[PDB]
């Protein structure tokens, strides 16, 4: 998965 914490 991407990770809920990676997009910022």
């Amino acid at each position, epitope marked *: *998965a*991407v*990770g*809920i*914490g*990676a*997009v*910022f």
Partner: antibody
Amino acid sequence: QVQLLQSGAELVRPGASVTLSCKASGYAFSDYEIHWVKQTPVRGLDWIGAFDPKSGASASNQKVKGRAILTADKSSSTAYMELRSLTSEDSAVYYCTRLRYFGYFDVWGTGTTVTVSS
Amino acid sequence: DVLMTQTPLSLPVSLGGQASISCRSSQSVVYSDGDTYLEWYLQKPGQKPKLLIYKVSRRFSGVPDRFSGSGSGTDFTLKISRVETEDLGVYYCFQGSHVPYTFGGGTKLEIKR
């Protein structure tokens, strides 16, 4: 020697809360998020939520909410998931697993068997 | 939200045979980094879930080459060659590109002997 340790089982009265513990060993705690996955009796994995110790972010899937509180204790390298006002619909085996950014669920916990009953 | 339809619900295959599991998403599961975060997991009876395939076609460390993943857009396939007794369990596709992340319904491998 990466491992994720969870409590064996929790029996919860209906309408109460439970706090599940997922504690990591063998790696830098803040470099991996901790995700929680609910497994139902015969099949069905259901992603409940996640916490990122690096950023402090939280997220949950929407069948549960008002009730899931995801935290982590970096001091003690421990993640926690609180689930409020439980019904028999929450009784399941709850697994914790780790996720590096753009990685995958490579290491899983033993799982905590939660039973909601009077 | 993103929906994951897995077929079949159970899959009988002879020992040493060839198995094919299909998974199909409600939307495209290409992420905003260019990659497609499609994963395959196995949960044996009484054991914790295990990772086999990530990034539609890439094999996790320790997973044999008999397991082959492939996919294109909304249709994804896991292929298991020369099926072993150790292959028994429920296989789950997983999308990790759009939160909430979602699993498939699972496919139960029952082997004929």
